[PDB]
PDB file of C-alpha atoms and ligand atoms in Angstrom:
ATOM      1  CA  UNK C   1      -4.855 -13.358  14.471  1.00 38.08           C
ATOM      2  CA  UNK C   2      -6.163 -10.653  12.459  1.00 40.88           C
ATOM      3  CA  UNK C   3      -3.116  -8.290  12.231  1.00 45.09           C
ATOM      4  CA  UNK C   4      -2.289  -4.901  10.583  1.00 46.73           C
ATOM      5  CA  UNK C   5       0.806  -6.655   9.106  1.00 46.64           C
ATOM      6  CA  UNK C   6       2.909  -4.794   6.442  1.00 50.20           C
ATOM      7  CA  UNK C   7       6.186  -3.191   5.336  1.00 52.58           C
ATOM      8  CA  UNK C   8       7.180   0.100   3.592  1.00 52.53           C
ATOM      9  CA  UNK C   9       9.721  -0.204   0.708  1.00 52.42           C
ATOM     10  CA  UNK C  10      13.448   0.591   0.771  1.00 54.77           C
ATOM     11  CA  UNK C  11      14.755   3.688  -1.120  1.00 55.22           C
ATOM     12  CA  UNK C  12      16.907   6.842  -0.457  1.00 52.78           C
ATOM     13  CA  UNK C  13      14.509   8.750  -2.788  1.00 52.74           C
ATOM     14  CA  UNK C  14      12.837  10.224  -4.754  1.00 50.93           C
ATOM     15  CA  UNK C  15      10.174   7.461  -4.309  1.00 54.32           C
ATOM     16  CA  UNK C  16       9.223   4.250  -2.385  1.00 54.57           C
ATOM     17  CA  UNK C  17       6.144   1.930  -2.097  1.00 52.29           C
ATOM     18  CA  UNK C  18       4.138   0.264   0.756  1.00 55.11           C
ATOM     19  CA  UNK C  19       2.447  -3.128   1.323  1.00 58.40           C
ATOM     20  CA  UNK C  20       0.087  -3.660   4.343  1.00 60.41           C
ATOM     21  CA  UNK C  21      -2.879  -5.758   5.537  1.00 61.48           C
ATOM     22  CA  UNK C  22      -6.256  -3.976   5.567  1.00 60.74           C
ATOM     23  CA  UNK C  23      -8.798  -5.426   8.040  1.00 62.80           C
ATOM     24  CA  UNK C  24     -12.515  -4.630   8.606  1.00 63.60           C
ATOM     25  CA  UNK C  25     -13.999  -5.141  12.145  1.00 62.76           C
ATOM     26  CA  UNK C  26     -17.438  -3.725  11.101  1.00 63.98           C
ATOM     27  CA  UNK C  27     -20.683  -5.218   9.790  1.00 61.38           C
ATOM     28  CA  UNK C  28     -20.560  -2.913   6.721  1.00 62.46           C
ATOM     29  CA  UNK C  29     -17.791  -2.728   4.033  1.00 64.02           C
ATOM     30  CA  UNK C  30     -14.720  -0.465   4.281  1.00 60.60           C
ATOM     31  CA  UNK C  31     -13.052   1.170   1.338  1.00 62.61           C
ATOM     32  CA  UNK C  32      -9.481   2.508   1.201  1.00 63.08           C
ATOM     33  CA  UNK C  33      -9.397   5.426  -1.331  1.00 60.45           C
ATOM     34  CA  UNK C  34      -6.027   7.114  -0.467  1.00 61.11           C
ATOM     35  CA  UNK C  35      -3.285   7.396   2.160  1.00 61.43           C
ATOM     36  CA  UNK C  36      -0.947   9.899   3.860  1.00 59.77           C
ATOM     37  CA  UNK C  37       2.447   9.520   5.737  1.00 60.38           C
ATOM     38  CA  UNK C  38       5.083  11.808   7.407  1.00 62.09           C
ATOM     39  CA  UNK C  39       7.853  10.449   5.075  1.00 60.82           C
ATOM     40  CA  UNK C  40       6.558  11.423   1.539  1.00 62.13           C
ATOM     41  CA  UNK C  41       5.191  14.692  -0.073  1.00 65.42           C
ATOM     42  CA  UNK C  42       2.618  12.659  -2.079  1.00 66.99           C
ATOM     43  CA  UNK C  43       1.177   9.144  -2.150  1.00 66.76           C
ATOM     44  CA  UNK C  44      -0.612   7.328  -5.038  1.00 66.90           C
ATOM     45  CA  UNK C  45      -2.673   4.081  -4.903  1.00 66.87           C
ATOM     46  CA  UNK C  46      -1.520   1.408  -7.417  1.00 66.80           C
ATOM     47  CA  UNK C  47      -1.921  -2.135  -8.731  1.00 69.20           C
ATOM     48  CA  UNK C  48       0.848  -4.431 -10.070  1.00 68.85           C
ATOM     49  CA  UNK C  49       0.022  -7.225 -12.578  1.00 70.64           C
ATOM     50  CA  UNK C  50       1.234  -9.644 -15.314  1.00 70.50           C
ATOM     51  CA  UNK C  51       1.080  -9.199 -19.138  1.00 71.46           C
ATOM     52  CA  UNK C  52       2.172 -11.104 -22.181  1.00 68.82           C
ATOM     53  CA  UNK C  53       4.216  -9.289 -24.865  1.00 65.22           C
ATOM     54  CA  UNK C  54       5.200 -11.488 -27.938  1.00 64.43           C
ATOM     55  CA  UNK C  55       4.674 -14.747 -25.867  1.00 66.77           C
ATOM     56  CA  UNK C  56       7.091 -13.243 -23.258  1.00 67.66           C
ATOM     57  CA  UNK C  57       5.767 -12.928 -19.683  1.00 66.58           C
ATOM     58  CA  UNK C  58       6.301  -9.241 -18.611  1.00 68.35           C
ATOM     59  CA  UNK C  59       4.811  -7.261 -15.648  1.00 66.57           C
ATOM     60  CA  UNK C  60       2.934  -3.911 -15.418  1.00 65.47           C
ATOM     61  CA  UNK C  61       1.754  -1.298 -12.850  1.00 65.41           C
ATOM     62  CA  UNK C  62      -1.104   1.274 -12.842  1.00 65.06           C
ATOM     63  CA  UNK C  63      -2.833   3.719 -10.453  1.00 66.13           C
ATOM     64  CA  UNK C  64      -6.338   2.664  -9.224  1.00 65.94           C
ATOM     65  CA  UNK C  65      -9.296   4.601  -7.628  1.00 64.74           C
ATOM     66  CA  UNK C  66      -9.642   2.561  -4.361  1.00 60.28           C
ATOM     67  CA  UNK C  67      -9.429  -0.835  -2.615  1.00 57.63           C
ATOM     68  CA  UNK C  68     -12.392  -2.611  -0.926  1.00 56.23           C
ATOM     69  CA  UNK C  69     -12.561  -4.700   2.284  1.00 56.46           C
ATOM     70  CA  UNK C  70     -15.784  -6.704   3.083  1.00 53.19           C
ATOM     71  CA  UNK C  71     -17.247  -6.747   6.672  1.00 51.94           C
ATOM     72  CA  UNK C  72     -15.392  -8.955   9.245  1.00 51.65           C
ATOM     73  CA  UNK C  73     -12.889  -9.708   6.393  1.00 53.70           C
ATOM     74  CA  UNK C  74      -9.431  -8.508   5.273  1.00 50.04           C
ATOM     75  CA  UNK C  75      -7.542  -7.708   2.005  1.00 46.98           C
ATOM     76  CA  UNK C  76      -3.782  -6.872   1.811  1.00 44.67           C
ATOM     77  CA  UNK C  77      -1.633  -4.550  -0.256  1.00 44.86           C
ATOM     78  CA  UNK C  78       1.185  -7.007  -1.319  1.00 45.85           C
ATOM     79  CA  UNK C  79       4.570  -7.038  -3.259  1.00 49.59           C
ATOM     80  CA  UNK C  80       3.076  -9.149  -6.119  1.00 50.06           C
ATOM     81  CA  UNK C  81       0.124  -6.691  -6.592  1.00 50.00           C
ATOM     82  CA  UNK C  82      -1.644  -3.728  -4.963  1.00 48.25           C
ATOM     83  CA  UNK C  83       0.457  -1.088  -3.171  1.00 48.78           C
ATOM     84  CA  UNK C  84       0.814   2.590  -2.307  1.00 53.35           C
ATOM     85  CA  UNK C  85       3.520   4.520  -4.215  1.00 49.94           C
ATOM     86  CA  UNK C  86       5.224   7.094  -1.918  1.00 48.59           C
ATOM     87  CA  UNK C  87       6.740  10.157  -3.704  1.00 51.76           C
ATOM     88  CA  UNK C  88       8.921  13.066  -2.456  1.00 51.84           C
ATOM     89  CA  UNK C  89      10.355  11.289   0.625  1.00 54.48           C
ATOM     90  CA  UNK C  90      11.476  12.862   3.914  1.00 55.08           C
ATOM     91  CA  UNK C  91      13.361   9.866   5.340  1.00 52.20           C
ATOM     92  CA  UNK C  92      15.729   7.823   3.194  1.00 50.31           C
ATOM     93  CA  UNK C  93      13.840   4.516   3.789  1.00 50.79           C
ATOM     94  CA  UNK C  94      16.370   1.995   5.195  1.00 47.87           C
ATOM     95  CA  UNK C  95      15.928  -1.646   6.254  1.00 51.13           C
ATOM     96  CA  UNK C  96      14.794  -2.084   9.903  1.00 49.01           C
ATOM     97  CA  UNK C  97      13.092   1.309  10.439  1.00 52.45           C
ATOM     98  CA  UNK C  98       9.359   1.827  11.181  1.00 51.05           C
ATOM     99  CA  UNK C  99       6.980   4.300   9.485  1.00 55.34           C
ATOM    100  CA  UNK C 100       3.285   5.252   9.814  1.00 57.91           C
ATOM    101  CA  UNK C 101       0.511   5.771   7.210  1.00 58.28           C
ATOM    102  CA  UNK C 102      -3.008   7.264   7.427  1.00 60.19           C
ATOM    103  CA  UNK C 103      -5.466   5.039   5.411  1.00 60.41           C
ATOM    104  CA  UNK C 104      -8.188   7.323   3.970  1.00 61.11           C
ATOM    105  CA  UNK C 105     -11.490   5.345   4.061  1.00 62.50           C
ATOM    106  CA  UNK C 106     -14.642   6.284   2.025  1.00 60.05           C
ATOM    107  CA  UNK C 107     -17.236   8.538   3.752  1.00 60.44           C
ATOM    108  CA  UNK C 108     -15.931  10.264   6.918  1.00 57.92           C
ATOM    109  CA  UNK C 109     -13.339   7.618   8.008  1.00 58.80           C
ATOM    110  CA  UNK C 110      -9.573   7.127   8.514  1.00 57.10           C
ATOM    111  CA  UNK C 111      -7.442   4.369  10.122  1.00 55.87           C
ATOM    112  CA  UNK C 112      -3.802   5.274  11.012  1.00 56.76           C
ATOM    113  CA  UNK C 113      -1.387   2.255  10.942  1.00 58.85           C
ATOM    114  CA  UNK C 114       2.312   1.736  11.812  1.00 56.36           C
ATOM    115  CA  UNK C 115       4.655  -0.736  10.045  1.00 55.30           C
ATOM    116  CA  UNK C 116       8.376  -1.638   9.554  1.00 54.01           C
ATOM    117  CA  UNK C 117      10.508  -0.730   6.537  1.00 52.71           C
ATOM    118  CA  UNK C 118      11.879  -3.823   4.675  1.00 51.98           C
ATOM    119  CA  UNK C 119      14.206  -4.202   1.675  1.00 53.08           C
ATOM    120  CA  UNK C 120      11.734  -6.781   0.217  1.00 52.85           C
TER     121      UNK C 120
HETATM  122 CU1  CU1 Y   1       3.727   1.684  -7.922  1.00 49.32          CU
END
């Protein structure tokens, strides 16, 4: 209905990414500021976006300080935009595995989630 629906990205190393649906069951807002996982030494929180250069449509990527989710609502990390970057892997991330992440939420909170690995 609601669903914690996502996938982690394919890579032997040194780095991967992750996309996943962030859902808020509370009456106050949640705020995803970092992650963790058993299959990377580090994780960073990023955006992906579109630029022009010379009239030529060309993409970009940056780190960001946090994501927000409003009460009773949801917002996803997605392939065309916001994502975790995983660095210093422990598994070579293949297609059709499963991996878990801790989602570090602002002010005394965490939500651990579990998701497949896709080559998408
Ligand atoms: Cu990235």
